């Protein structure tokens, strides 16, 4: 299942992220990709020879913007570094 | 002249900045150790 934050377990590793169709060209023998700082970035599906990019699914900080309780109790919430769809 | 001197002066920084990337060494350092700190912080996850 693609384009969803899922709990994936490919051949030898596991993780949570968003599996998308990639534009990378893996070598016929290579199996796993990596980012610069030793981070899983792409995986070849053991069944279809497709290259899938792994994007970690949305998360961020939640900050409460409130006036002082001596003034009001109505608040406003800031979902850091996400778009207004996944919330 | 003094205006011209300052005017020609202004252009020189443009060349000096354009020529050597070492003109911005300090700020590059500010990025670099910060980059290094995170990377070292990231790599530690691989240690037993």
């Amino acid at each position: 299942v693609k384009n969803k934050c899922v709990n994936f377990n490919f051949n030898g590793l596991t993780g949570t992220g968003v599996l998308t169709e990639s534009n990378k060209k893996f070598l016929p023998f290579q199996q796993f990709g990596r980012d610069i700082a030793d981070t899983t970035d792409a995986v070849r599906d053991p069944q279809t020879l497709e290259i899938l990019d792994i994007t970690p699914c949305s998360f961020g900080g939640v900050s409460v913007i409130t006036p002082g309780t001596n003034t009001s109790n109505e608040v406003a919430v800031l979902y850091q570094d996400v778009n207004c769809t996944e919330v | 002249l003094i205006a011209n001197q300052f005017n020609s002066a202004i252009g020189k920084i443009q060349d000096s900045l354009s020529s050597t990337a070492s003109a911005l060494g300090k700020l590059q350092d500010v990025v670099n150790q910060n980059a290094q700190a995170l990377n070292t912080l990231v790599k530690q996850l691989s240690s037993n």
Partner: peptide, 20 residues
């Protein structure tokens, strides 16, 4: 000339703001 739970908060004063 310039170039896991780890997040980067953005700067409050944006680059366009900084220029002004």
């Amino acid at each position: 000339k310039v170039t896991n739970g780890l997040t980067v908060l953005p700067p409050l004063l944006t680059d366009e703001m900084i220029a002004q």
